[PDB]
Write a protein that holds these residues in place. Sequence first.
Motif, PDB file in Angstrom:
ATOM      1  N   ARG A 114       0.829  -1.218   0.000  1.00 53.33           N
ATOM      2  CA  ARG A 114       0.000   0.000   0.000  1.00 53.33           C
ATOM      3  C   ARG A 114       0.854   1.255   0.000  1.00 53.33           C
ATOM      4  O   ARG A 114       0.594   2.179  -0.756  1.00 53.33           O
ATOM      5  N   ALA A 169      -1.089  -5.431   0.475  1.00 60.18           N
ATOM      6  CA  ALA A 169      -2.288  -4.844  -0.154  1.00 60.18           C
ATOM      7  C   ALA A 169      -3.359  -5.841  -0.642  1.00 60.18           C
ATOM      8  O   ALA A 169      -4.365  -5.435  -1.202  1.00 60.18           O
ATOM      9  N   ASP A 297      -7.356   3.496  -2.973  1.00 63.24           N
ATOM     10  CA  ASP A 297      -7.070   2.074  -3.092  1.00 63.24           C
ATOM     11  C   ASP A 297      -6.798   1.854  -4.581  1.00 63.24           C
ATOM     12  O   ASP A 297      -7.434   2.487  -5.441  1.00 63.24           O
ATOM     13  N   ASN A 299      -5.966  -1.693  -7.100  1.00 64.23           N
ATOM     14  CA  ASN A 299      -5.956  -3.156  -7.008  1.00 64.23           C
ATOM     15  C   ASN A 299      -5.657  -3.782  -8.346  1.00 64.23           C
ATOM     16  O   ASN A 299      -6.289  -3.473  -9.355  1.00 64.23           O
TER      17      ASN A 299
HETATM   18 MN    MN Z   1      -7.523  -3.004  -2.212  1.00 64.09          MN
END
Ligand code: MN
Length: 337
Positions: A114, A169, A297, A299
């Motif tokens: 992260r 993460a 965030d 991803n």
């Molecule tokens: Mn995430």
Amino acid sequence: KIHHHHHHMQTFLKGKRVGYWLSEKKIKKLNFQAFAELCRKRGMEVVQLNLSRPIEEQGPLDVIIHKLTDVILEADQNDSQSLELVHRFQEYIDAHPETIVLDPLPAIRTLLDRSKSYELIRKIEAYMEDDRICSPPFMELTSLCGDDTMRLLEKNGLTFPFICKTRVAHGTNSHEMAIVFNQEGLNAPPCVVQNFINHNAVLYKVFVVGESYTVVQRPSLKNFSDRESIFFNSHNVSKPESSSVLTELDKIEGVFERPSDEVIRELSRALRQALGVSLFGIDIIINNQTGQHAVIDINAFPGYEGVSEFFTDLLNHIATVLQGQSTAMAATGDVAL
Ligand SMILES: [Mn+2]
Ligand SMILES: Nc1ncnc2c1ncn2[C@@H]1O[C@H](COP(=O)(O)OP(=O)(O)NP(=O)(O)O)[C@@H](O)[C@H]1O
Ligand SMILES: [Mn+2]
């Protein structure tokens, strides 16, 4: 007023071979077999890769689609089996530069941590210099809280409230988070801390498939303090059917707008071009004090729940990457804004 098409680049899909590696759970959630069917209809071959087996015999492959994220994370934790798998994959990719990898492992690795990811987003945003975008202050706390914590937070622009997240993460042990509202709340590390941004409890999941994206609205943490720190698991917060007092907005406050497509496009291009990912999501919230977009965030290869066009978009992206390779569309220099 859709001007970009793929009918012509789709003509080259015939005879192409696509390998994929996905966990059985992800194959199920995606109904990935239906994507495989779609590709066969364009004259493509799709095959599930088995990374326990020599990969040469499984190819030739023109494209590999994968989500090795968790295998990589396990290999980072010195899992012998996972190390073996990644090594094998890596050896193969290295031997076959002609095989397009969606997405390259270096690109994936950026999104595994992260703090690293948030710093990359921060740098990318500084480079774009768009006043519609903000990077919430964040930092990584490694030591357990103590006498210097307050000053450390302060000098990094951390303010109350802030949310605490794991450094890793994805995967098991990545979803437990905390919201800290005051100095007494500082027993909630190691972890990443990121200023909490009030955003009227609406999350805009931008699901990117290369050149196309879909925005899907999700439940999100409410607006907000002598109060006890909040601990929650992010599995419970921002799924389609998620419902809890944590995401029940008391009332709309301040700026309440949908995200700008112009802004999403610039972020998508910059992230794709800088990081090399194509199958990813960014979670945007709209700061209710400034109206700015905040990416909270990012991803690699997420669920795409609510993205009904995912398969056609994925096929279009495979067609695009093949077109790019065939005409040597390599990027040079820095990200061109
Ligand atoms: Mn995430
Ligand atoms: N800085 C922030 N300010 C306000 N709300 C936040 C912030 N960061 C996270 N959230 C909220 O907390 C939820 C979970 O945080 P997030 O960092 O997206 O977790 P995650 O486990 O990586 N989720 P995902 O990968 O999308 O399944 C988000 O969906 C938002 O509702
Ligand atoms: Mn999220």
